[PDB]
Amino acid sequence: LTCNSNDLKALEGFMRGLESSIDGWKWNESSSFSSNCCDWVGISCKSSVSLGLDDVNESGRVVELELGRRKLSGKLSESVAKLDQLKVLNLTHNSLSGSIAASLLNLSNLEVLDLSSNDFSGLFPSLINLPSLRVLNVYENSFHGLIPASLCNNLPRIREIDLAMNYFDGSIPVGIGNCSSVEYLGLASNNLSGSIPQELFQLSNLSVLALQNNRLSGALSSKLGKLSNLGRLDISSNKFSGKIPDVFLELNKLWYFSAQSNLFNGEMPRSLSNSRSISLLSLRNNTLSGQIYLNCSAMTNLTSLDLASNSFSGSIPSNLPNCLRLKTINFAKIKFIAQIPESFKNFQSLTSLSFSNSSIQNISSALEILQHCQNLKTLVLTLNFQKEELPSVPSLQFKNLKVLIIASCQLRGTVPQWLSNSPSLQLLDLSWNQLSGTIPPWLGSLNSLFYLDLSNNTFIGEIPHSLTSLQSLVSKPDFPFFKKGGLQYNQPSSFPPMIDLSYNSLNGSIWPEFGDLRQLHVLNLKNNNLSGNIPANLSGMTSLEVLDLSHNNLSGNIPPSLVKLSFLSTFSVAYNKLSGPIPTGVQFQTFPNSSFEGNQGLCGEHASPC
Amino acid sequence: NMEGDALHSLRANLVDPNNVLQSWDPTLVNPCTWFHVTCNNENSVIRVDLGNADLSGQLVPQLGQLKNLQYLELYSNNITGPVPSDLGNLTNLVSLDLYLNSFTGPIPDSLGKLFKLRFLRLNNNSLTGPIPMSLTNIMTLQVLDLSNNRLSGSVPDNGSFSLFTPISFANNLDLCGPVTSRPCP
Amino acid sequence: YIYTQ
Ligand SMILES: *[C@@H]1O[C@H](CO)[C@@H](O)[C@H](O)[C@H]1NC(C)=O
Ligand SMILES: *[C@@H]1O[C@H](CO)[C@@H](O)[C@H](O)[C@H]1NC(C)=O
Ligand SMILES: *[C@@H]1O[C@H](CO)[C@@H](O)[C@H](O)[C@H]1NC(C)=O
Ligand SMILES: *[C@@H]1O[C@H](CO)[C@@H](O)[C@H](O)[C@H]1NC(C)=O
Ligand SMILES: *[C@@H]1O[C@H](CO)[C@@H](O)[C@H](O)[C@H]1NC(C)=O
Ligand SMILES: *[C@@H]1O[C@H](CO)[C@@H](O)[C@H](O)[C@H]1NC(C)=O
Ligand SMILES: *[C@@H]1O[C@H](CO)[C@@H](O)[C@H](O)[C@H]1NC(C)=O
Ligand SMILES: *[C@@H]1O[C@H](CO)[C@@H](O)[C@H](O)[C@H]1NC(C)=O
Ligand SMILES: *[C@@H]1O[C@H](CO)[C@@H](O)[C@H](O)[C@H]1NC(C)=O
Ligand SMILES: *[C@@H]1O[C@H](CO)[C@@H](O)[C@H](O)[C@H]1NC(C)=O
């Protein structure tokens, strides 16, 4: 109940190290807060008698200091090591900088040390005596040089070690094998190089191992089969090489394996094709070759399978619909030059499929097959079927489809009616095709659609009024997408809401009612026949980041009300019939002179004086 | 990625009742797909347009880490606290708009290290103290609005201030000079 | 256009 005096003096030292005051602590001494550190917020006391301290005084001792997310700036004072009964030290997600005193790695009672997400830098202390420590987390700091070679010599009770997101360098220390009790080891996002020391495979309680994003090299030795309790392994973004060892019968708990973006080659080992455990499998962006083979009788846990961007040859495996839990497939950038097997009509587990840039052919049968997969949510056909004809058959139905992208195929035909059988469409990309006709007004009735890309086609006619009324533009496991370097979008909600009709033949004017779409981030009308006045009411699109009207026939004035778009970063009226003063609002003054070019009668700032 | 970290530091420090920062996800390899951020072709942030976003909270020094930043538009919000000196580390800035906010404290002297700056608008805040002299060194500066602050001091007509007029310094605490309406004693 | 890889 009553703060120990030495503990209080240690906490007072910690306090000066900081550049700002912690609320819930009596700080300045003009503070009206309690002088008893035990009622300070983030501090937990235990009786001296419960800690087995039999001495003359009965006082509260500080066993937990938990300051996570308190917005702390300063150093970490050495005097924190004066608190000898400390069990938990949690400083996570703060601004603290400086080095870590060796003193603090000497505390005998310490159980959790969590320093993560700070500015700590310099070398990590080489002397670790922390015989009570379950958890050591330095994730996300500025530490550099070697991981301590002696790291585990004094950590007999250790459970989680996380060094990830630092500058640590060198080979993983041969002493990493003395970590015997460890379950979690994060090394990812560092400078580590050389081979994996054979001694890593002696850690028999190892459960999760994160090695991704380093320079690790050499083969991946068969000794991996020694870690039989391993459930999750990320080897991604290193440079390893050679065949993948055929150990997967030995790792019977392994549910997660990610080797992507390495130099691996040869065929996938037989045992991996047989794993009864693996759930997520990502091999993408390696040199793997041969005919893809999975025993879907053996593979009863498979859910995410990602082979994209590999050297595979032969046929699309026709037995994959026999993997009963399999949900997502990224087959992108494997060049099959075949069509989709008839048997995919039975894939009822599949929610997401990408054949992007896989040289698939006969789109007519592709859609006829794929409509029978009831659970299809995401379908990416980009860069296939080149020059074929986008089926106009009314019969096709994808009921559950959220995302449809068939882009850059040079497809011919019109926007087909069958697409209306997907009332839940959020995202539609038909861009970069030979598609013709008029954009059908029924698109307006899609109540979930927030992203529409019709760009770089032959469409003609007017923009339909109904787009003005799209419900989701009026008001408000993993399958990465990349947008043409390409930026990565993790799910559909990551794309700014968009209407991109750019690069077509559309005639007509721009409807005033666009001002009703308050959730629209991007409007791209560039490169069309659009004529008439830019409506003042565009001012009402409050969320609009990008407004591109360039290369059209538009006449009249840029409406001064466009100053009310405060989020508008990027804008072009270039090459139109436009005339009059350019709006002087703040966003406009930051637009480049090229945004207004090719309009003779435009004047004011950005042009010749009116 | 360090730029993502900088802007995320800014996010943890702001207050966003309308979720305009909802798309800002620190786990991403960079922040180019984040809404309201624009990057150049080498994928480095050249714009942040947060104007009139109902944002509250405060800035952060980490803002100073965006080496290619050009336009910082924070105007018309409720952001409070100091204007960080680290802002002076942005050499490529042509526009800094902090106006119509709640900022207090003085104006960093480091602001005079922005030699490409066209637009400086700090007007309509609570800012106090003197007007940093280095600003006269910025010859590219087209617009200056310090009006409606608590500033106190002398304002020379030398250098780039020869360009400006009393409306740029109007409605302060105690300001005098030839570029102002009141001559110094 | 959007693609995956
Ligand atoms: C540190 O505290 C945060 C809450 O601020 C918590 O989420 C995290 O689990 C703690 N770290 C450890 C190692 O317990
Ligand atoms: C592993 O532990 C043993 C026994 O304590 C010791 O001989 C060896 O030096 C340790 N490993 C390293 C490299 O410190
Ligand atoms: C690994 O697990 C078992 C049970 O969790 C335990 O008995 C043993 O202490 C652990 N192994 C080592 C090497 O400490
Ligand atoms: C593919 O792997 C190589 C070599 O590891 C890497 O450098 C490259 O960035 C990877 N490509 C992608 C898009 O991940
Ligand atoms: C299947 O995967 C799940 C996690 O998705 C995991 O809990 C389980 O261990 C795996 N099953 C087997 C048989 O290993
Ligand atoms: C595939 O799996 C089943 C069940 O595991 C097994 O009995 C069968 O012989 C395997 N076939 C091959 C060719 O691996
Ligand atoms: C498509 O594959 C081609 C040919 O193999 C390659 O040049 C190109 O990078 C790929 N494009 C995309 C977006 O995947
Ligand atoms: C539009 O499409 C063709 C291929 O369909 C492509 O080569 C061209 O560069 C694209 N142009 C624009 C304006 O996007
Ligand atoms: C744009 O052009 C006008 C005159 O045509 C000029 O005063 C202004 O400085 C130019 N803006 C830029 C940044 O080039
Ligand atoms: C303007 O005068 C001030 C005050 O004496 C001085 O500090 C500053 O450097 C001068 N600027 C120029 C460019 O002459």
Give the resolution in Å: 2.8
- Output the CA–CA distances (angstroms, integers) from residue A129 to A105, A107, A514, in the order listed: 6, 7, 67
Nearest to A17 by CA among A91, A86, A69: A91
The CA distance from A534 to A573, in Å, is 10
Chain length of chain B:
185
Q: If you write DSSP's letter for every residue of A449-498 in order, what string do you get?
A: --EEE--SS---SPPPGGGGG-HHHH------EEE--PEEE-SGGGSPPE
Reading the block at residue A37, the tokens are: 């550190």
Q: If you write DSSP's letter for every residue of A166-204 in order, what string do you get?
A: SEEEEEPPGGGGG-TT--EEE--SSEEESPPPGGGGG-T
Burial A20-36 (b: 16+ CB within 10 A, else e): eebeebbbeeeeeeeee
B29 exposed, middle or buried (CB, 10 Å; 0-12, 13-18, 19+)? exposed
The CA distance from B174 to A35, in Å, is 43
A109 exposed, middle or buried (CB, 10 Å; 0-12, 13-18, 19+)? middle
B35/A490 CB distance under 8 A: no
What number does the ligand 9 atom closest to the CA of A605 have?
Answer: 3
Chain B CB within 8 Å of residue A546 CB: no
Q: How many CB atoms lie within 10 A of CB B54?
A: 13
Q: Report the half-sphere exposure of A49 (CA within 13 A, side-chain side).
A: 5
Helix (H/G/I), strand (E/B), else coil: A429: strand
What number does the ligand 8 atom closest to the CA of A503 have?
Answer: 13
Region of A218 on the Ramachandran plot (φ > 0 left; ψ -120 to 50 alpha; else beta): left
Reading the block at residue A169, the tokens are: 């360098």
CB within 8 Å of A289: residues ≥ 6 apart: A265, A266, A267, A310, A311, A312, A313
Please indicate whether residue A410, judged by its CB atom, sits closer than 6 Å to ligand 8.
yes
DSSP code of A325?
T
- The number of the ligand nearest the C-alpha atom of A432 reads 8
Instruction: Specify whether the CB–CB gap between A267 and A289 falls below 8 A.
Output: yes
The CA distance from A199 to A185, in Å, is 14
Provide the residue range defining the domain that includes B49: 1-185
Query: How close A505 comes to chain C (CA, Å)?
Result: 19
- Backbone angles phi and psi of A123, in degrees to 5: -75, 140
Reading the block at residue A315, the tokens are: 């046929």
A603 exposed, middle or buried (CB, 10 Å; 0-12, 13-18, 19+)? middle
Strand locations in A335-410 (E): 352-354, 378-380, 403-405
Nearest to A185 by CA among A166, A167, A158: A158
| Structural method | X-ray
CB within 8 Å of A309: residues ≥ 6 apart: A284, A285, A286, A332, A333, A334, C5
- Backbone angles phi and psi of B137, in degrees to 5: -70, -10
Instruction: Specify whether the CB–CB gap between A294 and A318 falls below 8 A.
Output: no
Amino acid (1-letter code) at residue A527: N
Task: Identify the closest residue of chain B to A71 by CA–CA distance.
Answer: B13
B52/A496 CB distance under 8 A: no
**Rg (alpha carbons) of chain C, rounded to whole number:** 5
Dihedral sign from CA coordinates of B84, B86, B89, B92: negative
Helix (H/G/I), strand (E/B), else coil: A595: helix
Write out the H or E segment, with its range, that includes residue B152: strand B150-154
The CA distance from B81 to B95, in Å, is 20
- Relative to beta strand A403-405, strand A378-380 is parallel
CA of A114 from ligand 6 middle (Å) equals 46
Write out the H or E segment, with its range, that includes residue B11: helix B2-13
Chain A CB within 8 Å of residue B3 CB: no
- Output the CA–CA distances (angstroms, integers) from residue A27 to A4, A72, A81, A282, in the order listed: 17, 14, 20, 52
Nearest to A108 by CA among A89, A127, A91, A133: A133
CB within 8 Å of A426: residues ≥ 6 apart: A402, A403, A448, A449, A450, A451, A472, A492
Instruction: Specify whether the CB–CB gap between A432 and A356 falls below 8 A.
Output: no
In the structure, do chain B and chain A come into contact, i.e. share 3 or more CB pairs under 8 Å? yes
The CATH number that applies at residue B149 is: 3.80.10.10
In the structure, do chain C and chain B come into contact, i.e. share 3 or more CB pairs under 8 Å? no
How many structural domains are present in chain B? 1
Chain B CB within 8 Å of residue A567 CB: yes
A356/C1 CB distance under 8 A: no
Query: How close C4 comes to chain A (CA, Å)?
Result: 5
C2/A382 CB distance under 8 A: yes
DSSP code of B96?
E
Q: Mark which residues 34-53 of B lie under 8 Å from A by CB.
A: 35-36, 38, 43, 47, 49, 51-53
* Residue labelled with tokens 């030290």: A89
Reading the block at residue A572, the tokens are: 């072009």
DSSP code of A138?
-
Nearest to A151 by CA among A197, A195, A119, A85: A197
The CA distance from B143 to B119, in Å, is 5
Please indicate whether residue A253, judged by its CB atom, sits closer than 6 Å to ligand 5.
yes
Q: Mark which residues 53-82 of B lie under 8 Å from A by CB.
A: 53, 71, 73, 75-76
- Backbone angles phi and psi of A466, in degrees to 5: -60, -25
The structural domains of chain A, with segments of one domain joined by +, span 1-610
For residue A171, list its beta bridge partners.
Answer: A193
The CA distance from B46 to A487, in Å, is 16
A482/C4 CB distance under 8 A: yes
Write out the H or E segment, with its range, that includes residue B144: strand B143-145
| Spacing of C-alpha A439 from chain mean position | 34
CB within 8 Å of A544: residues ≥ 6 apart: A520, A521, A522, A523, A538, A565, A567, A568
CB within 8 Å of A105: residues ≥ 6 apart: A125, A127, A128, A129, A130
CA of A274 from ligand 4 middle (Å) equals 27
What number does the ligand 7 atom closest to the CA of A408 have?
Answer: 13
Query: How close A150 comes to chain B (CA, Å)?
Result: 31
Mutate which of A248, A253, A255, A274 for ligand 5? The one with the most ligand atoms within 8 Å of its CB, which is A255
**Which chain A residues are within 8 Å of C4, Cβ to Cβ?**
308, 330, 332, 354, 356, 380, 382, 479-482
